[PDB]
Write a protein that binds this ligand. Structure first.
Ligand SMILES: COc1ncc(Oc2c(Cl)cc(NC(=O)CC3CCN(S(C)(=O)=O)CC3)cc2Cl)cc1C(C)C
Length: 253
């Protein structure tokens, strides 16, 4: 199944769907690189209460996830899977897709990430009380930055992050397997064509993205146990549904 021309057509539609849902164009993020938070602004963030920082981050992550949901809806083959399988793939892979896309907003030269209009270092997030997770995210972004991914590579890699036939709970495993296989052929064909197959051995293990996501769910549990009404009253409904329906409504539109 799937000939060379169909594989190349899949590459183009995956890259197109990603450009339409990339949230911020690469040039927009790169243009802001010398716009860095001052010492006074960093201090201001560290002095914010733990629950105010958690609400702001949950809000920014929710916006990012919304673009990942739209990417999935435009992704060739995804809307043809059943609703249960669409939701199983998004619940397990939306945050993983966000963590990979995040490397585009990371500047390896000074170890800063784009957040609320400017670039700031890891110390900006000290008030969350989850410094091991924040450093793990910055390390992961640094490791992805060393690969120098093109926008097309990001599009193809993130399509495979989401289209994972091994997620527990899939009702039509074969359908997800066939779609994952075509996306993998598209990704490997594009790397072979561009002389970039050397990135394959440098891509992170599947367990690394899973550990970052498990750490996020665990740190959220600790926060929620301490501040339950903050989560109930001020966290985005989509965020709570995924990590603590909205997804069904988002996919139906
Ligand atoms: C997992 O838990 C987390 N992941 C990241 C966290 O910190 C952030 C947040 Cl919340 C946002 C940004 N940045 C943005 O949201 C801006 C965004 C960057 C990505 N681009 S993009 C997709 O165009 O490249 C769009 C703009 C960066 C970091 Cl470190 C916090 C958490 C938990 C512990 C709460």
């Amino acid at each position: 199944m799937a000939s060379l021309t169909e594989i190349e057509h899949l590459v183009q539609s995956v890259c197109k769907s990603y450009r339409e849902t990339c949230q911020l164009r690469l040039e927009d993020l790169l243009r802001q690189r010398s716009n860095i938070f001052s010492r006074e602004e960093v201090t201001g963030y560290q002095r914010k209460s733990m629950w105010e920082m958690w609400e702001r981050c949950a809000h920014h992550l929710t916006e990012a996830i919304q673009y990942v949901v739209e990417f999935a809806k435009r992704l060739s083959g995804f809307m043809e899977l059943c609703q249960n399988d669409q939701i199983v793939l998004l619940k397990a892979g939306a945050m993983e897709v966000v963590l990979v896309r995040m490397c585009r907003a990371y500047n390896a030269d000074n170890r800063t990430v784009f957040f609320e209009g400017k670039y700031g270092g890891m110390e900006l997030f000290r008030a969350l009380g989850c410094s091991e997770l924040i450093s793990s995210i910055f390390d992961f972004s640094h490791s992805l930055s060393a690969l120098h991914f093109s926008e097309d590579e990001i599009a193809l890699y993130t399509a495979l992050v989401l289209i994972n036939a091994h997620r527990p709970g899939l009702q039509e495993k074969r359908k997800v397997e066939q779609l994952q296989y075509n996306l993998e052929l598209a990704f490997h064909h594009h790397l072979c064509k561009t002389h970039r197959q050397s990135i394959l051995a440098k891509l992170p293990p599947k367990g690394k993205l899973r550990s970052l996501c498990s750490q996020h769910v665990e740190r959220l549990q600790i926060f929620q146990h301490l501040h339950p009404i903050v989560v109930q009253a001020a966290f985005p409904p989509l965020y709570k549904e995924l990590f603590s329906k909205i997804l069904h409504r988002l996919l139906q539109e």
